[PDB]
Design an enzyme around this catalytic site. Sequence first.
Site, PDB file in Angstrom:
ATOM      1  N   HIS A  51      46.934  31.042   8.895  1.00  0.00           N
ATOM      2  CA  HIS A  51      46.503  32.492   9.062  1.00  0.00           C
ATOM      3  C   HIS A  51      46.519  33.064   7.900  1.00  0.00           C
ATOM      4  O   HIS A  51      47.556  32.762   6.705  1.00  0.00           O
ATOM      5  CB  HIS A  51      47.144  33.191   9.934  1.00  0.00           C
ATOM      6  CG  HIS A  51      47.185  32.604  11.534  1.00  0.00           C
ATOM      7  ND1 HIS A  51      48.323  31.814  11.786  1.00  0.00           N
ATOM      8  CD2 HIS A  51      46.608  32.901  12.381  1.00  0.00           C
ATOM      9  CE1 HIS A  51      48.032  31.495  13.094  1.00  0.00           C
ATOM     10  NE2 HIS A  51      47.187  31.934  13.529  1.00  0.00           N
ATOM     11  N   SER A  52      45.683  34.398   7.453  1.00  0.00           N
ATOM     12  CA  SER A  52      45.993  35.157   6.445  1.00  0.00           C
ATOM     13  C   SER A  52      47.253  35.426   6.278  1.00  0.00           C
ATOM     14  O   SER A  52      47.968  35.603   5.053  1.00  0.00           O
ATOM     15  CB  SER A  52      45.139  36.240   6.375  1.00  0.00           C
ATOM     16  OG  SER A  52      45.150  36.768   7.881  1.00  0.00           O
ATOM     17  N   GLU A  53      47.965  35.562   7.198  1.00  0.00           N
ATOM     18  CA  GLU A  53      49.541  35.830   7.536  1.00  0.00           C
ATOM     19  C   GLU A  53      50.371  35.616   8.786  1.00  0.00           C
ATOM     20  O   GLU A  53      49.611  35.948   9.795  1.00  0.00           O
ATOM     21  CB  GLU A  53      49.889  37.199   6.767  1.00  0.00           C
ATOM     22  CG  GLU A  53      48.900  38.165   6.766  1.00  0.00           C
ATOM     23  CD  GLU A  53      48.262  38.513   5.323  1.00  0.00           C
ATOM     24  OE1 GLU A  53      49.405  38.781   4.398  1.00  0.00           O
ATOM     25  OE2 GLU A  53      47.267  38.638   5.036  1.00  0.00           O
ATOM     26  N   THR A  54      51.482  35.202   8.494  1.00  0.00           N
ATOM     27  CA  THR A  54      52.278  34.955   9.757  1.00  0.00           C
ATOM     28  C   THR A  54      53.377  35.882   9.829  1.00  0.00           C
ATOM     29  O   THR A  54      54.300  35.999   8.750  1.00  0.00           O
ATOM     30  CB  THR A  54      52.746  33.478  10.179  1.00  0.00           C
ATOM     31  OG1 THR A  54      51.549  32.663   9.894  1.00  0.00           O
ATOM     32  CG2 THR A  54      53.635  33.159  11.294  1.00  0.00           C
ATOM     33  N   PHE A  74      54.405  36.449   5.675  1.00  0.00           N
ATOM     34  CA  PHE A  74      54.033  35.271   4.974  1.00  0.00           C
ATOM     35  C   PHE A  74      52.605  34.687   4.826  1.00  0.00           C
ATOM     36  O   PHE A  74      51.885  34.805   6.086  1.00  0.00           O
ATOM     37  CB  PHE A  74      54.907  34.050   5.068  1.00  0.00           C
ATOM     38  CG  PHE A  74      56.472  34.383   4.832  1.00  0.00           C
ATOM     39  CD1 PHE A  74      57.022  34.803   5.553  1.00  0.00           C
ATOM     40  CD2 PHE A  74      57.174  33.435   3.627  1.00  0.00           C
ATOM     41  CE1 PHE A  74      58.574  34.866   5.371  1.00  0.00           C
ATOM     42  CE2 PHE A  74      58.324  33.695   3.286  1.00  0.00           C
ATOM     43  CZ  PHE A  74      59.035  34.417   4.047  1.00  0.00           C
TER      44      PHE A  74
END
EC number: 5.1.-.-
Length: 310
Positions: free
Chosen positions: A55-58, A74
């Site tokens: 994902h673009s971020e977790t 992240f």
Amino acid sequence: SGRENLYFQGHMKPQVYHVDAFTSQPFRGNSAGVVFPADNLSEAQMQLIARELGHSETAFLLHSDDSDVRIRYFTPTVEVPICGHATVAAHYVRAKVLGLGNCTIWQTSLAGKHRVTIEKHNDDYRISLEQGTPGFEPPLEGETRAAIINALHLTEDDILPGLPIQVATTGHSKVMIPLKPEVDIDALSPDLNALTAISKKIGCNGFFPFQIRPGKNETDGRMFSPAIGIVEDPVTGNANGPMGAWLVHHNVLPHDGNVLRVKGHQGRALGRDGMIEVTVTIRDNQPEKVTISGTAVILFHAEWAIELGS
């Protein structure tokens, strides 16, 4: 109490949720991962997990002593202080799982402390993030202005009159580019290299061209940030939040109370439509502070089938 909670967040099996933020329509909006508990995970393991999910971020939920929850964010390659869509996704999952109901809670992250509002309504949730005070850099002009305008393959005839192209921020700066309504925003195809080039000249990795819907306090925008990995983010809270503040700052949109509400649409050309409700509290006709809101939809969640720890 708070000691029992820490014991659980270290002995319970980790889980992962996959959710699309700023939409209630599966496969749209901006996707983000949410993993919890993360207390028994290392910065390394977390980074490896964010790389795995993609994902673009977790967002990783941790125990907090002073606040209700600590979150670390992240990207697939590096840690980030805070992230809008990943944050709404995180609190959406947290509300679902705990069946929270209407309330306000505090989170902690590298971005400091932030208050979040959870509003229950017909089985679903709306998450509100208090972004705080906004900031503006001097309007970009001359050669740089023309550089930004040309990189979008547009002319001065396409920019709203009397309005500047400037950096606005509520945490992660973005250059506001006010377009006329006739501009075909989805057909935009910037000169990506030219954009990263000017991002290094001005010190802003994000360009946010947007237009206002006729007779409505709603916008449609696109967030381009090639200077970094993300070519175009589907729906950016750090773009729409400062846009509303920018709107008040330049009196672009009429407001009656001590507030200005704008529904910022974004991600249509990407096939990832999303919507962020931007509410600006006004004082002395200035944007005091910005709150962004949205909903989300969980695609699936699961208990990790593999051991997590070292």
